[PDB]
Write an enzyme that holds these catalytic residues in place. Structure first.
Site, PDB file in Angstrom:
ATOM      1  CB  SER A  32     -30.282  41.536  79.443  1.00  0.00           C
ATOM      2  OG  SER A  32     -29.493  42.632  78.949  1.00  0.00           O
ATOM      3  CG  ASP A  89     -24.355  23.423  82.978  1.00  0.00           C
ATOM      4  OD1 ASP A  89     -24.276  24.537  82.655  1.00  0.00           O
ATOM      5  OD2 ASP A  89     -24.861  22.451  82.300  1.00  0.00           O
TER       6      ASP A  89
HETATM    7  C1  LIG Z   1     -25.914  26.279  73.039  1.00  0.00           C
HETATM    8  S1  LIG Z   1     -25.406  25.230  74.398  1.00  0.00           S
HETATM    9  C2  LIG Z   1     -23.844  24.410  73.886  1.00  0.00           C
HETATM   10  C3  LIG Z   1     -23.337  24.190  75.521  1.00  0.00           C
HETATM   11  N1  LIG Z   1     -21.785  23.844  75.222  1.00  0.00           N
HETATM   12  C4  LIG Z   1     -20.954  24.795  75.127  1.00  0.00           C
HETATM   13  O1  LIG Z   1     -21.011  25.844  75.193  1.00  0.00           O
HETATM   14  C5  LIG Z   1     -19.654  23.936  74.930  1.00  0.00           C
HETATM   15  C6  LIG Z   1     -18.854  23.579  76.414  1.00  0.00           C
HETATM   16  C7  LIG Z   1     -17.641  22.916  76.439  1.00  0.00           C
HETATM   17  C8  LIG Z   1     -16.531  23.564  75.926  1.00  0.00           C
HETATM   18  C9  LIG Z   1     -15.224  23.158  76.189  1.00  0.00           C
HETATM   19  C10 LIG Z   1     -14.990  21.812  76.210  1.00  0.00           C
HETATM   20  C11 LIG Z   1     -16.187  21.174  76.541  1.00  0.00           C
HETATM   21  C12 LIG Z   1     -17.545  21.501  76.597  1.00  0.00           C
HETATM   22  O2  LIG Z   1     -18.329  24.873  74.306  1.00  0.00           O
HETATM   23  C13 LIG Z   1     -18.726  25.193  72.931  1.00  0.00           C
HETATM   24  O3  LIG Z   1     -19.943  24.826  72.502  1.00  0.00           O
HETATM   25  N2  LIG Z   1     -17.768  25.892  72.349  1.00  0.00           N
HETATM   26  C14 LIG Z   1     -18.380  26.369  71.073  1.00  0.00           C
HETATM   27  C15 LIG Z   1     -17.210  26.170  69.836  1.00  0.00           C
HETATM   28  C16 LIG Z   1     -15.941  26.695  70.535  1.00  0.00           C
HETATM   29  N3  LIG Z   1     -15.440  27.610  69.451  1.00  0.00           N
HETATM   30  C17 LIG Z   1     -16.075  27.447  71.661  1.00  0.00           C
HETATM   31  C18 LIG Z   1     -16.594  26.479  72.896  1.00  0.00           C
HETATM   32  C19 LIG Z   1     -23.888  23.315  76.269  1.00  0.00           C
HETATM   33  O4  LIG Z   1     -24.377  22.337  75.968  1.00  0.00           O
HETATM   34  N4  LIG Z   1     -23.773  23.515  77.614  1.00  0.00           N
HETATM   35  C20 LIG Z   1     -24.331  22.641  78.535  1.00  0.00           C
HETATM   36  C21 LIG Z   1     -23.238  22.330  79.537  1.00  0.00           C
HETATM   37  C22 LIG Z   1     -22.305  21.459  79.263  1.00  0.00           C
HETATM   38  C23 LIG Z   1     -20.876  21.584  79.815  1.00  0.00           C
HETATM   39  C24 LIG Z   1     -19.909  20.418  79.634  1.00  0.00           C
HETATM   40  C25 LIG Z   1     -19.842  19.859  77.988  1.00  0.00           C
HETATM   41  C26 LIG Z   1     -21.454  19.910  77.428  1.00  0.00           C
HETATM   42  C27 LIG Z   1     -22.351  20.933  78.104  1.00  0.00           C
HETATM   43  C28 LIG Z   1     -25.658  23.457  79.342  1.00  0.00           C
HETATM   44  O5  LIG Z   1     -25.334  24.345  80.128  1.00  0.00           O
HETATM   45  C29 LIG Z   1     -26.381  24.017  78.300  1.00  0.00           C
HETATM   46  N5  LIG Z   1     -27.740  24.039  78.167  1.00  0.00           N
HETATM   47  C30 LIG Z   1     -28.859  24.975  78.603  1.00  0.00           C
HETATM   48  C31 LIG Z   1     -30.133  25.025  78.664  1.00  0.00           C
HETATM   49  C32 LIG Z   1     -30.739  23.957  78.216  1.00  0.00           C
HETATM   50  C33 LIG Z   1     -30.104  22.770  77.862  1.00  0.00           C
HETATM   51  C34 LIG Z   1     -28.644  22.727  77.685  1.00  0.00           C
HETATM   52  O6  LIG Z   1     -27.857  21.839  77.438  1.00  0.00           O
END
Ligand SMILES: CSC[C@H](NC(=O)[C@H](Cc1ccccc1)OC(=O)N1CCC(N)CC1)C(=O)N[C@@H](CC1CCCCC1)[C@@H](O)Cn1ccccc1=O
Length: 330
Positions: A199, A35
């Protein structure tokens, strides 16, 4: 020194990518989600509440001879999607693709959110953002990249995410074989601790390129592409039947529709995201409504260039004193 690890999508939708990582001695292999949007390296461990572990591979500190408790050290993290994890900290040997780093902070999860327990394919995270974001207290810890920087041939790591296929994470070198044409480098702002860049604009399909500054972050830990409302509305306006649903929480379109490509600007260069990448399948099994890969950022506060955009290019994260982001077609 260098490192090269193959990264694999966790599902047919490319929701996330997992990369094998060796932790401890002897090595305990865990599949982590790299990440670049976070700076914590936490893992499911022998300490995690037994009720919150569902099929994930746990790191057992007591089985590692190089693992030592970082007394008093704690960590607590909450992601944009609401996820959460917390616990204590250990220092152990961590290797990625042959590249070893001793004394790395390995944050062992004592508490993990439901979302995590649900995800059996992801054993933990490997933050590759800037160390200023680390959640370890009272003593902040460095990221894996920061710890390797010195030993790397080049203070850089590249992201080569595959579409419905495995990709590569390289540390310390640029595979001039993995991309086409030239790499276009762009300035990175570290102020917020993100791989934040600007961008130079966008184009929908074969449409006119709109010159507009879009400040966002390169986030491999985020699945989709989150852009400003105006940009997102212009994209989905070209998809017949597409609309913003309050129930589903985002733009959805007729699964039978043909998605136009999305072009984002990096300097004078142009990266094209094929429309196929923007299709995230049925909102629900059997549904004829599909989830769009390009959503609005109006509610996040920041634009995110997630996997959807990143996997369309060869991405170089230059961790130099003056960090820069490199984008090349592939
Ligand atoms: C608007 S940030 C929402 C974002 N999490 C996602 O993108 C998740 C990731 C995921 C997908 C599938 C399985 C498990 C996890 O997947 C979805 O949200 N989706 C939407 C619904 C589905 N249709 C498609 C898949 C997010 O917190 N990322 C963070 C990384 C981690 C990765 C592991 C799971 C938790 C999140 C991170 O870099 C984002 N960050 C960036 C800046 C500041 C704070 C912050 O926290």
């Amino acid at each position: 020194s260098t490192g090269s690890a193959t990264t694999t999508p966790i599902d047919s939708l490319d929701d996330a990518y997992i990369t094998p990582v060796q932790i401890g001695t002897p090595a305990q292999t865990l599949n982590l989600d790299f990440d670049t949007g976070s700076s914590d390296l936490w893992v499911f461990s022998s300490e995690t509440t037994a009720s919150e572990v569902d099929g994930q591979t746990i790191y057992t500190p007591s089985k590692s001879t190089t693992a030592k408790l970082l007394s008093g050290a704690t960590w607590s993290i909450s992601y944009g999607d609401g996820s959460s994890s917390s616990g204590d900290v250990y220092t152990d040997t961590v290797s990625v693709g042959g590249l070893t780093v001793t004394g790395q902070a390995v944050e062992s999860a004592k508490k993990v959110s439901s979302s995590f327990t649900e995800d059996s394919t992801i054993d933990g995270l490997l933050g590759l953002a800037f160390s200023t974001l680390n959640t370890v207290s009272p003593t902040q810890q460095k990221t894996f990249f920061d710890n390797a920087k010195a030993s790397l041939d080049s203070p850089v790591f590249t992201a080569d995410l595959g579409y419905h296929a495995p990709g590569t994470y390289n540390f310390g070198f640029i595979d001039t074989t993995a991309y086409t044409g030239s790499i276009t480098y762009t300035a990175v702002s570290t102020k917020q601790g993100f791989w934040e860049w600007t961008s130079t604009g966008y184009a929908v399909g074969s449409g006119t390129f709109k010159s507009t500054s879009i400040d966002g972050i390169a986030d491999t830990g985020t699945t989709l592409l989150y852009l400003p409302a105006t940009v997102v509305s212009a994209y989905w306006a070209q998809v017949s039947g597409a609309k913003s649903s309050s129930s589903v929480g985002g733009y959805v379109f007729p699964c039978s529709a043909t998605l136009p490509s999305f072009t984002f600007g990096v300097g004078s260069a142009r990266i094209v995201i094929p429309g196929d990448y923007i299709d995230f399948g049925p909102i629900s099994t059997g549904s004829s409504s599909c989830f769009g890969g390009i959503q609005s950022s109006a509610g996040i506060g920041i634009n995110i260039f997630g996997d959807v955009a990143l996997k369309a290019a060869f991405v170089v994260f230059n961790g130099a004193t003056t960090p820069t982001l490199g984008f090349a077609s592939k």
